[PDB]
Design a protein around this motif. Structure first.
Motif, short mmCIF file in Angstrom:
data_model
loop_
_atom_site.label_atom_id
_atom_site.label_comp_id
_atom_site.label_asym_id
_atom_site.label_seq_id
_atom_site.Cartn_x
_atom_site.Cartn_y
_atom_site.Cartn_z
N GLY B 27 0.87 -1.27 -0.06
CA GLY B 27 0.08 0.00 0.04
C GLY B 27 0.90 1.29 -0.11
O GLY B 27 0.71 2.02 -0.96
N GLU B 28 1.66 1.31 0.86
CA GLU B 28 2.78 2.47 0.93
C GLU B 28 3.57 2.77 -0.26
O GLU B 28 4.00 3.91 -0.49
N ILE B 29 3.87 1.36 -0.99
CA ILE B 29 4.85 1.44 -2.18
C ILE B 29 3.91 1.98 -3.27
O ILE B 29 4.01 2.91 -4.06
N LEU B 30 2.69 1.32 -3.60
CA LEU B 30 1.91 1.33 -4.38
C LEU B 30 0.82 2.95 -4.19
O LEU B 30 -0.04 3.33 -5.31
N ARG B 31 1.15 3.44 -3.20
CA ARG B 31 1.06 5.02 -3.07
C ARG B 31 1.79 5.75 -3.84
O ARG B 31 2.88 6.11 -3.59
N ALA B 32 1.41 6.02 -4.91
CA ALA B 32 1.79 6.68 -6.17
C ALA B 32 1.74 8.18 -5.72
O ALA B 32 1.63 9.11 -6.54
N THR B 33 2.10 8.66 -4.42
CA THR B 33 1.22 8.72 -3.36
C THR B 33 -0.23 9.33 -3.95
O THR B 33 -0.31 10.46 -3.96
N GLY B 34 -0.95 8.20 -3.45
CA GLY B 34 -2.31 8.18 -4.34
C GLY B 34 -2.24 7.88 -5.79
O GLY B 34 -2.74 6.85 -6.26
#
Ligand SMILES: [Ca+2]
Ligand SMILES: [Ca+2]
Lengths: 34, 34
Positions: B27-34
């Motif tokens: 989630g924190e990686i795949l946070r493209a941030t957003g």
């Protein structure tokens, strides 16, 4: 979302089916992001 | 600097000290941030 998209993405990357990501798999995520 | 860079990114995300990444951390990686 509500986690479904991410769960699938996780799974795609989680090649060795351990419910985790490791260093090369992280490589494979972080690929596009320089 | 490559290889070592990946180790750092891994570590930034790998809070729970398991030598892995989990769903929230992904989630924190795949946070493209957003
Ligand atoms: Ca895996
Ligand atoms: Ca972790």
């Amino acid at each position: 979302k509500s986690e479904e998209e991410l769960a699938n993405a996780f799974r795609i990357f989680d090649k060795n089916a351990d419910g985790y990501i490791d260093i090369e798999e992280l490589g494979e995520i972080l690929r596009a992001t320089g």
